[PDB]
Design a protein around this ligand. Structure first.
Ligand code: CL
Ligand code: CL
Ligand code: CL
Ligand code: CL
Ligand code: CL
Ligand code: CL
Ligand code: MG
Lengths: 212, 221
């Protein structure tokens, strides 16, 4: 319900603003918007409450504001440790927390993803299962969105996607799976794995009748 | 210093029950609303339940309304979450949090993992991710192993018994709705090697004492 951009970035010392969009009943009706920072493997920490207040020991380079149905978190003078997931949160939003934004503090050149899409193997089909495996590699910043299509229509059931994590060459990789029955697999002309990275999309397609 | 410490996380089977507890210190516990939040692995945060300073009001997110009960003990600075009719959807790290007002969580515990699965220890089934018949014409080709349906974590994956490490990436595991984990491992190799170099992923699943070595071959087609 509270919508955030999936990612945002800046180089050390630059500013970045991330937005949190709700409705007139929550962000527009109340000044009780919060911002939480979460580093990998750690609990969230409150960075901003009541739209613009900072807990003690949150650096003043974090500031919060609200206009309309949108709250915004601004980091003025990013430091590398600010790289984290940021969630907004609001009173009167049913699950409270926004969809979250990975803020990257840029430390290497932008790298576009390679997408590798494997159809179900003959062996897995013979075991009565059908997994499409979409491997996404060599991207940076480490934030992607993955969407699946069957015959051009969006497919949400049966998808599991892993959070990007570092490769040993320090670019990122992520994986996504579309788990189908063999009957489902054969009942469509094509399937696609569509990766959105930094506002642009790369899509790979396979077909049950096509030797990928 | 405000400190919140969860305990009680663990593996529980669907339909099962589980009680979480939180030990709070460093503030007037009985002066504050307290709240539980949760986070499925690699996913976003979700509020779960809160409870008024004196316990006279309890509230739950819709997904847990009527399955979960939150309670507090002000004399013992303790917050509880009774979880019932548990489901795979509920697999999450659960955080104890202090609510300073209007669903604002100014302090958070370290979190406790609840995994909801009916699975018993199970070795993986490994399927080849054969290189594209297009990538096969030259240059490089990605090939891999799909390591399916095992429990518990972890599996480790090597390639050619550890002789192949460059360009290997083993992904984190997903917990499927079945209650079992899957992951993939991929390696990029020279396409010119595909007809002469054998590529074998070595999948070790210590919990089941299972090791699988799967040869990954170019596709006949
Ligand atoms: Cl970097
Ligand atoms: Cl740069
Ligand atoms: Cl690499
Ligand atoms: Cl109570
Ligand atoms: Cl506070
Ligand atoms: Cl790896
Ligand atoms: Mg960085």
């Amino acid at each position: 319900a509270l919508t955030q951009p999936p990612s945002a970035s800046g180089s050390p010392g630059q500013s970045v603003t991330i937005s949190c969009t709700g409705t007139s009943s929550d962000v527009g009706a109340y000044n009780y918007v919060s911002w939480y920072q979460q580093h990998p493997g750690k609990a969230p920490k409150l960075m901003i409450y009541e739209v613009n207040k900072r807990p003690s020991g949150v650096p003043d380079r974090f500031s919060g504001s609200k206009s309309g149905n949108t709250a915004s978190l601004t980091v003025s003078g990013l430091q590398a440790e600010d790289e984290a997931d940021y969630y907004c949160g609001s009173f009167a939003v049913s699950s409270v927390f926004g969809t979250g934004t990975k803020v990257t503090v840029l430390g290497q050149p932008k790298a576009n993803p390679t997408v590798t899409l494997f159809p179900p193997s003959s062996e897995e089909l013979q075991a009565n299962k059908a997994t499409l495996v979409c491997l996404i590699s060599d991207f940076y910043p480490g934030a992607v969105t993955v969407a699946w299509k069957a015959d051009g229509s969006p497919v949400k059931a049966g998808v599991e996607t892993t959070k990007p994590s570092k490769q040993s060459n320090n670019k990122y990789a992520a994986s996504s799976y579309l788990s189908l029955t063999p009957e489902q697999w054969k009942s469509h002309r094509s399937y696609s794995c569509q990766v959105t990275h930094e506002g642009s999309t790369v899509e790979k397609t396979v077909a049950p009748t096509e030797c990928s | 210093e405000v400190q919140l410490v969860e305990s009680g996380g663990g593996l529980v089977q669907p339909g099962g029950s589980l009680r979480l507890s939180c030990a709070a210190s460093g503030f007037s516990f009985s002066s504050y609303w307290m709240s539980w939040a949760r986070q499925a692995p690699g996913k976003g945060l979700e509020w779960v339940a809160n409870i008024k300073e004196d316990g006279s009001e309890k509230y739950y997110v819709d997904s847990v309304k009527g399955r979960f009960t939150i309670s507090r003990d002000n004399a013992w600075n303790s917050l509880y979450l009774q979880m019932n009719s548990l489901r795979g959807e509920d697999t999450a790290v659960y955080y104890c949090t202090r609510d300073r007002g209007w669903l604002t969580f100014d302090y958070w515990g370290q979190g406790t993992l609840v995994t909801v699965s009916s699975a018993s220890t199970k070795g993986p089934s490994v399927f080849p991710l054969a290189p594209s018949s297009k990538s096969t014409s030259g240059g490089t080709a990605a090939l891999g192993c799909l390591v399916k349906d095992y429990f518990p974590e972890p599996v480790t994956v090597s390639w050619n018994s550890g002789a192949l490490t460059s360009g290997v990436h083993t992904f984190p595991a997903v917990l499927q709705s079945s209650g079992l984990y899957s992951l993939s491992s991929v390696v990029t190799v020279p396409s010119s090697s595909l007809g002469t170099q054998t590529y074998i992923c070595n999948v070790n699943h210590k919990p089941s004492n299972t090791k699988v070595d799967k040869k990954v071959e170019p596709k006949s087609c």
